[PDB]
Structures are given as structure tokens and as C-alpha cells.
Amino acid sequence: GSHMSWVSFKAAGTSGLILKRCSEPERYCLARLMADALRGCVPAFHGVVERDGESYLQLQDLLDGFDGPCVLDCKMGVRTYLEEELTKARERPKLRKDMYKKMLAVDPEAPTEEEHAQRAVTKPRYMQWREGISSSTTLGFRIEGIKKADGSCSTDFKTTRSREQVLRVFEEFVQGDEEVLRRYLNRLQQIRDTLEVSEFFRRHEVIGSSLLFVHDHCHRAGVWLIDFGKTTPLPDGQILDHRRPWEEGNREDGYLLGLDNLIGILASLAER
């Protein structure tokens, strides 16, 4: 019914809307998307509003349509950081002790002798590590979180990596609802078709965006692309195919390798 009801975001005055802190790449992207083939595949963007001297994107609340929505957020791409973060990490690293601690926790032998000595790692190193223990590197997406109808939430998916492990999370998420799974697959097929023709999509590097899966006990089911905070345009005349492997300088994100794999896994789940 609303994300603020479950609760970066703030309550809107208008019913069915939500406010997200304004970032310049994301505002630029949403503006473009409202005039793109992908218009219906993203939350409606109504412009910017000022609240307590701060800028907020006025968005469709994707949960408004649903009665007790179940939510799964799926981070798309083989790569989860911008190329400019690699350059910045080489020239002027910002060491992060928080990130070192979480690594040691998951895998004590993951950090190098020097990272151990620093008690810190760079963001790109941490994010590359997160890509490899999850499905991101191999399948081009990863499950980040679920918010269930019983108010329960989970982010315990950092080591969800194999095709079967991912299938099992989706199996538990849809709880045997054949109609929700069919509607999700129909929506993902239509999203893939829209992405493959989108003028926006071929011309932008799409990093750190998610597919948001929403469904309810009335068998309502929707999927949207969200979070364009790290989506950036390529130089004019340059396009990405969104399937070929990333090689530093080619800015390839593996987004459609992710969506191809995701469709394949949900299609497998539907045959079970």
C-alpha cells in the first residue's frame, strides 16, 4: 500500500506518491526515461519538490496498488561500481575499515596481507569481492533483499551465488503462487523487449540499478527498474550491447546477461 508505511525516502503529501532525495544523475535519468520506450517500466517521475530546504524526486509509490505487498530487490549487472571509482582508487584511495571488517567476517583469507595491515580496503575491491561471493559475477544479477507480507525483512543473501540458490530464494518468495510467477515472467519478457529497443538503454551505462518485484495475496504482481543514481551516458555515437563481458574502458555492465539469466531461472521455477 506504501513504502513509507513499511518504513533516503520521505512521505509525500499526495496519495500514491513518495519522495526520494534528489541526486543529479538520477533526476537526469528519470526525466529522459519518461520520454523513452522504458516509461512504463520505471516509477512515474512527477518532477522535483523542496522540503526543509532539500530537493526530492516526486515518484510513484510502487507499493500503492498492492494489499500487503511482498517485495524483492534484485541488483542488475555483472559490475556494481562506476569505472571512475577504479581510477580514483588507484590515484587517491579512500580506505574503508567498515568494508574490511565485513570481508574478514564472510572470509578471513579474502583480504591481502596489506589490507589486513591497513585494516581497510578500497570500495572497488570490496564491491568486486561482493560480486564474486554472490551471483553478480557469474549470472549478472544478485538478490539484495526481501520485505514479506508479515512485516519481516531480510538482507541475508551476500553468499547467494548458484543458479539453484537463487531459484530457492524466488521459490520461497512466490510461495507456490503460479499466477504471481506467470505475471512476473510475462512482465520480465516485456521489460527485456523494451530494453532491447530503448534509445536511453543503448546509450547509458546502467550500474547499481535494481529490478523491484512486488506481489500480494490477491495475485497482483509487478516489476519495475529503480535507482538510476549511477546510470551515466556514453560519448555520442557510442552504445553498449549490455551482454558482452566488462573490460576496463568498454563500460559494459552485463545488464541483459543478468536479465537473460533471471528470466531463465524463473522459467525453470515455473516448470517445477
Ligand SMILES: O=P(O)(O)OC[C@H]1[C@H](O)[C@@H](OP(=O)(O)O)[C@H](O)[C@@H](OP(=O)(O)O)[C@@H]1OP(=O)(O)O
Ligand atoms: O542501493 P545501495 O544504496 O545499497 O547502493 C549500494 C551500496 C552498497 O550496498 C554498500 O555496501 P554493502 O551493503 O555491500 O555493505 C556500500 O557501502 C555503498 O557505498 P557507500 O558506503 O555509500 O560509499 C553502496 O552505495 P553506492 O555508493 O554504490 O550508491
Ligand SMILES: Nc1ncnc2c1ncn2[C@@H]1O[C@H](COP(=O)(O)OP(=O)(O)O)[C@@H](O)[C@H]1O
Ligand atoms: N518508487 C518506489 N516506490 C516504492 N518503493 C520504492 C520505490 N523506489 C524504491 N523503493 C524502495 O526503496 C528501496 C531502495 O530504493 P533505491 O532506489 O534503490 O534507493 P537507495 O539505493 O537510495 O536505497 C527499494 O529496494 C524499494 O524497497
Ligand SMILES: [Mn+2]
Ligand atoms: Mn539502490
